[PDB]
C-alpha cells in the first residue's frame, strides 16, 4: 500500500449507476510504467492495461460493456500514469475492494486500494392507522423505508411517549433491505389529529427525511 | 505465492562463491509476460528485466558485477519465462528471501520466493594438551572449528567419560563464528596414549569430520 500510487480509500456509487475509481502514479515521473492491472481482492483481474498489447477486461463478470479506463490520451501518452477506472451499471456484486497496480520498471510494482460501495436509495412512505380507545397498546402509525442499501434507520419524532417497534426484511432487489417501523401506544382521545413524524436517515440522503402523519382516534 | 511460478524454497551458496536462483513461469504459455523483477523482502529491487527497456540491477549493493540472468536466448525469445538469477561473490549480507515476480498480462502478477543461504565452510584443528596427574579436572584435549557459518557442532567420541565444555566466539569473517571445544577430565595414568576423537558436524560437510588425537599423561 504505496504512497506514490494515489487512490481514494472509499468510493460510492448508486445501484445500477456509475462510478469512476481514480488511480494515479504520482510524479516526479522517474520510472517507466510497464503495465496496469486492477484486481479484486480474490485476485481476480478486473481490468488490465498494456502499452503494447492494449486493454483487456478478462472477467466475464466485469466485462468491457461495463468497465473502461478514463484515460483520455490520443492512443499515445509518453507515459500512462493515470489509471482511472470507470464502472457502469453498478451491481451489488461489485461492492468490493479494488487494487490498482502499476508494474513499474526497474522499480517493481506499486499499488493502491479503493473500497467501492454500492448504495441503494430507498423509497419512503408513512401513514397513520385509525384506532379505537382501549388499554392495549396498538400500532397507531407505521413508516417503511423500502429497498435500501444499506438498511435505512427510522426514528419517530413525537410528543407522545409511544414505544417504537421495527423489523428488517429482504428488499425486492438483491442485497437491498426494507425496514418496517411501527409506532405503538395505548390510544387516548386527546391524541386525535396530533402530528407524528417519521424520521428516516440513510447514506443517500443529504440529511434525515421526514414523513409527517396525523393520528386518528375514535370518538373525538 | 503462486504455483505457476516455479522456484526453489531454499538455495545455498558458499561465502564468496556463486549461486543460481531459478525461477520459471510454467507453461502452458497462456499469458504474455510484461516484465520480471527480483525483489528482496524489504521491497528493494535487486534485478529487473523488461522486454523493451532491457535489464537493470538498480541497487548499488547488488550490482551488475555480481548479478545476472542466466537466460540464454539470442536477445529475442518469443517469451521470457525463465527468470533464473545468478549471484557471484556471495556475501553474508545476501542471505535473504528473494521474490521472483512476473508481471503477466492480462493476468496480473505471479510470484515465487526463494531463501538464499550463505554457508561458510569452517577450518578444523585438534590437539591434546599434556597434563600431570591430579584430582582437578583439566582440559586434556581441545578442538576448534574456526570461521563457520552457521556455527559448527563439535562432539567428542571417547571411551573415557570426560565432561565436554565449549563456547562460541566471533569469526574472523563478518558473520562467521568460531567454535571452541575443550575436553576435560581428571588426568589418570591409564589414559596415556588413548586416542580421543573430535567429531565436528556442519552443513558444508558430507558428514561429520573426525580429528583424532592421542592423550598425553605424566609418568607412564
Ligand atoms: C491467466 O488467465 C488465463 C485465462 O483465464 C481465463 O478466464 C478468466 C476470466 C478467468 O476465469 C481465468 O480463471 C481463466 O483461466 C488462463 O488461461 C487458461 O489457463 C488454464 C491453465 O492454467 C487452461 O486450462 C487448461 O485447459 C486444458 C485444455 O483446454 C487442460 O489440458 C489443462 O489441464 C487445463 O485445465 C485454460 O484453458 C486457459 N485459457 C486459455 C484461453 O488459454 C491462464 O492460465 C492464467 N495464467 C495465470 C498465470 O494465472
Ligand atoms: C474492504 O476493505 C476495507 C478496508 O481494508 C481492510 O484492511 C485491509 C488492509 C485488509 O486487511 C482487509 O481485510 C480489510 O477489509 C474493509 O474495511 C474494514 O472491514 C473490516 C471487516 O473485515 C472491519 O473490521 C472490523 O473492525 C472492528 C473494530 O473497529 C471489529 O469490531 C470487527 O470485528 C471487524 O473486524 C473494519 O471496520 C473496516 N475498516 C474500515 C476503515 O471501514 C472492508 O470491510 C472490505 N470491504 C469491502 C466491501 O471490500
Ligand atoms: C524508483 O527508484 C528510482 C531510483 O531509485 C534510486 O536508487 C535505488 C538504488 C534505490 O536506492 C532507490 O531508493 C533510489 O530512489 C526513484 O527515483 C528517485 O525518486 C526520488 C523521489 O521519489 C528522487 O528524490 C527526489 O530528489 C529531488 C531532487 O533531486 C527532490 O526535489 C525530491 O524532494 C526527492 O527527494 C530521486 O532523485 C530519484 N532518482 C532519480 C535517478 O531520478 C523513484 O522514486 C522510485 N519510484 C518508485 C515508484 O518507487
Ligand atoms: C526467509 O523466509 C523463510 C520462510 O518464509 C517465512 O514465511 C514467509 C511466508 C514469511 O512469513 C516470513 O516472515 C518467514 O520467514 C524463513 O524461514 C522461517 O523463519 C522463521 C523466522 O522468522 C522461523 O519461524 C520460527 O518458527 C518456530 C516454530 O517452528 C518458532 O519456534 C520461532 O519462534 C520462529 O518464529 C521458521 O522456522 C522458518 N521456516 C522455515 C521453513 O525455515 C526465514 O527465516 C527467512 N530468512 C531469510 C534468511 O530470508
Swiss-Prot record, chains A, B:
Glycans are attached at residues 97, 107. Residues 1-219 are extracellular. Residues 1-116 form the Ig-like V-type domain. Brain, spinal cord, spleen, kidney, heart and liver. It comes from the Eukaryota. It comes from Mus musculus (Mouse). Modulator of T-cell signaling. Can be either a costimulator of T-cell function, or a coinhibitor, depending on the receptor it binds to. Upon binding to CD226, stimulates T-cell proliferation and cytokine production, including that of IL2, IL5, IL10, IL13, and IFNG. Upon interaction with PVRIG, inhibits T-cell proliferation. These interactions are competitive. Probable cell adhesion protein. Can form trans-heterodimers with NECTIN3. Interacts with CD226 or with PVRIG; these interactions are competitive and have a differential functional outcome on T-cell activation, either positive or negative, respectively. Binds with low affinity to TIGIT. Belongs to the nectin family. This is Nectin-2. The gene is Nectin2. It is found in: Cell membrane. Residues 122-216 form the Ig-like C2-type domain. Disulfide bonds join 23-100, 143-198.
Amino acid at each position: 500500500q504505496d504512497v506514490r500510487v494515489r487512490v481514494l480509500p472509499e468510493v460510492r456509487g448508486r445501484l445500477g449507476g456509475t462510478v469512476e475509481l481514480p488511480c494515479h502514479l504520482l510524479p516526479p515521473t522517474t520510472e517507466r510504467v510497464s503495465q496496469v492491472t486492477w484486481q479484486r481482492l480474490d485476485g481476480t483481474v478486473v481490468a488490465a492495461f498494456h502499452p503494447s498489447f492494449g486493454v483487456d477486461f478478462p472477467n466475464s463478470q466485469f466485462s468491457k460493456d461495463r468497465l473502461s479506463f478514463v484515460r483520455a490520451r490520443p492512443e499515445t501518452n509518453a507515459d500512462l500514469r493515470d489509471a482511472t477506472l470507470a464502472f457502469r451499471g453498478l451491481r451489488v456484486e461489485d461492492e468490493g475492494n479494488y487494487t490498482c497496480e502499476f508494474a513499474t520498471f526497474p522499480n517493481g510494482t506499486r499499488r493502491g486500494v479503493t473500497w467501492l460501495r454500492v448504495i441503494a436509495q430507498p423509497e419512503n412512505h408513512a401513514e397513520a392507522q385509525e384506532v379505537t380507545i382501549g388499554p392495549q397498546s396498538v400500532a397507531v402509525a407505521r413508516c417503511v423505508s423500502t429497498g435500501g442499501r444499506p438498511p435505512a434507520r427510522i426514528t419517530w419524532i413525537s410528543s407522545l411517549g409511544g414505544e417504537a417497534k421495527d423489523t428488517q426484511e429482504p428488499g425486492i432487489q438483491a442485497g437491498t433491505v426494507t425496514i418496517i417501523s411501527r409506532y405503538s401506544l395505548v390510544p387516548v382521545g386527546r391524541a386525535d389529529g396530533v402530528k407524528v413524524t417519521c424520521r428516516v436517515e440513510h447514506e443517500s440522503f443529504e440529511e434525515p427525511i421526514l414523513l409527517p402523519v396525523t393520528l386518528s382516534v375514535r370518538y373525538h
